[PDB]
Design an enzyme around this catalytic site. Structure first.
Site, PDB file in Angstrom:
ATOM      1  CG  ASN A   7      -1.865   1.193   1.265  1.00  0.00           C
ATOM      2  OD1 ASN A   7      -1.953   1.959   0.306  1.00  0.00           O
ATOM      3  ND2 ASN A   7      -2.609   1.327   2.356  1.00  0.00           N
ATOM      4  CG  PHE A   8       2.944   2.499  -3.497  1.00  0.00           C
ATOM      5  CD1 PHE A   8       3.591   1.454  -2.845  1.00  0.00           C
ATOM      6  CD2 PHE A   8       3.193   2.694  -4.856  1.00  0.00           C
ATOM      7  CE1 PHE A   8       4.472   0.625  -3.527  1.00  0.00           C
ATOM      8  CE2 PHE A   8       4.068   1.872  -5.545  1.00  0.00           C
ATOM      9  CZ  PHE A   8       4.713   0.833  -4.876  1.00  0.00           C
ATOM     10  CG  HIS A  89      -6.347   1.837   4.728  1.00  0.00           C
ATOM     11  ND1 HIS A  89      -5.943   2.795   5.632  1.00  0.00           N
ATOM     12  CD2 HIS A  89      -5.316   0.967   4.618  1.00  0.00           C
ATOM     13  CE1 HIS A  89      -4.724   2.515   6.054  1.00  0.00           C
ATOM     14  NE2 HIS A  89      -4.321   1.409   5.455  1.00  0.00           N
ATOM     15  CD  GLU A 158      -3.908  -2.363   7.349  1.00  0.00           C
ATOM     16  OE1 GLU A 158      -3.082  -2.637   6.464  1.00  0.00           O
ATOM     17  OE2 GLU A 158      -4.441  -1.239   7.447  1.00  0.00           O
ATOM     18  N   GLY A 164       1.149   2.463  10.871  1.00  0.00           N
ATOM     19  CA  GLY A 164       2.094   3.568  10.853  1.00  0.00           C
ATOM     20  C   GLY A 164       2.903   3.769  12.121  1.00  0.00           C
ATOM     21  CB  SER A 194       3.869  -1.738  12.516  1.00  0.00           C
ATOM     22  OG  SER A 194       3.334  -0.474  12.870  1.00  0.00           O
ATOM     23  CB  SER A 216       5.472   2.600   6.684  1.00  0.00           C
ATOM     24  OG  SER A 216       6.695   3.299   6.790  1.00  0.00           O
TER      25      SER A 216
END
Ligand SMILES: O=C(CCC1CCCCC1)N(CCO)C[C@H](O)[C@H](O)[C@H](O)[C@H](O)CO
Lengths: 231, 231
Positions: A7-8, A89, A158, A164, A194, A216
């Site tokens: 995921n950019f 998300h 998530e 993050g 993470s 990330s």
């Protein structure tokens, strides 16, 4: 092999993203097509000509096309030959206030277009701290919003407190163990939050972990490449 | 009276949008640069190398880059050399639920970067029903949300009830007349909402109308070029 999805978000420069895709396409083979996924932003993506990995978008408006200022619609994605999408998300639920009804509108629409849907769920730290019952109730309520039997469904868990920042193995083992009781046995269940080159392999060792959703850490091609090697 | 802006929304195919931009560039001259504006969707645009019209985006998230799944950010626009943006378009306020505080966040952020801002405002039919005093008060509250002295600001009055169907010359004359009483004298005030080749000239004839924000009618290049000759 298990799953690995990148995921950019909105962190990759346009040129960097384009090269990333081309490079990845050369480094991977056909057998990675349904194992590795990449979700760049609208600018960073490219027509879907990739046969070594799956190209998807991070969001879209649930309509064919029309008067939806600032939004991207399904005909465009069809033109780009993209048919994979992220929905729910945490960042969109919170920062862009996408309510459950709106997310349901997206699921139903893209499901009708036969899209592969990666539906995201996760609880806040406070819920986690209220106990097992509170987490089960919250998560099961989030899953009620969709059709758990749609065969092209992928669920990404998530925990919000891990995006993050990373959930413990004990956490992942128990939470995913519960989710496996609610989901179709054929639905891939990914862990996200993470994930990095250091804890990936371990996370992948849990039987109830069918893959990973990496934010990330994946913005560096080499990191992603390394994670792929643990699949 | 001198400005014309095209809003492609999410209605134009990617290939068509690209060809549209190139053809428009060949047709117009340097004199049209700060008079003609085009806002394609994220896919339909191209790197901003245009010298005969101004290229802009329909939306963006107020951050340089980061963990904002599904969003496009500041640095992305810098790479494409785009510094023109729409904010507050009715479709985003309602369908995407963009609140005044969120719009203000976007305004202040892009203000700092000297972006040319096209702030949209317009009342619901229900408000128009009540009476002119009703709309005046409603519009005032919407303008209350930003810095009217921002040198690179453009206000677009677009009656929600006239979007995608046109306001009478009378209501435009009056509502714009009112808006000219609180807005900075140098701020361009546009009219939008069912503007087409048939009513373009008359709307433009009104002194308090500095330009037009054209939606559906701009999707056909020839319609846009015709309206341009009325400037
Ligand atoms: O265990 C937790 C959170 C668990 C919840 C359980 C319910 C009560 C609140 C607490 N964290 C949260 C921290 O985000 C620690 C990380 O799992 C470790 O720090 C990490 O796995 C290690 O450092 C990797 O080398």
């Amino acid at each position: 092999t298990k799953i690995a999805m990148a995921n950019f978000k909105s962190a990759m420069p346009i040129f960097k993203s384009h090269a990333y895709l081309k490079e990845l396409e050369k480094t991977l083979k056909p057998q990675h097509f349904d194992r590795v996924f990449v979700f760049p932003d609208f600018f960073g993506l490219l027509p879907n000509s990739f046969l070594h990995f799956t190209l998807g978008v991070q969001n879209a408006y649930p309509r064919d096309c029309g008067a939806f200022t600032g939004e991207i619609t399904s005909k465009h994605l069809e033109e780009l030959k993209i048919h994979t999408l992220l929905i729910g998300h945490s960042e969109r639920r919170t920062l862009l206030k996408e309510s459950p009804s709106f997310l349901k509108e997206k699921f139903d629409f893209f499901k009708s277009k036969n899209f592969k849907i990666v539906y995201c769920i996760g609880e806040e730290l406070t819920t986690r701290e209220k106990g097992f019952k509170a987490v089960k109730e919250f998560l099961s309520e989030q899953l009620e919003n969709i059709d758990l039997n749609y065969p092209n469904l992928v669920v990404a868990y998530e925990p919000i407190w891990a995006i993050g920042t990373s959930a413990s193995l004990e956490d992942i083992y128990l939470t995913h163990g519960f989710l496996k009781q609610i989901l179709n046995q054929k639905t891939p269940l990914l862990y996200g939050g993470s994930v990095n080159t250091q804890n990936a392999k371990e996370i992948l060792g849990i039987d109830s972990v069918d893959g990973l959703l990496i934010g990330s850490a994946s913005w560096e091609l080499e990191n992603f490449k390394t994670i792929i090697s643990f699949l």
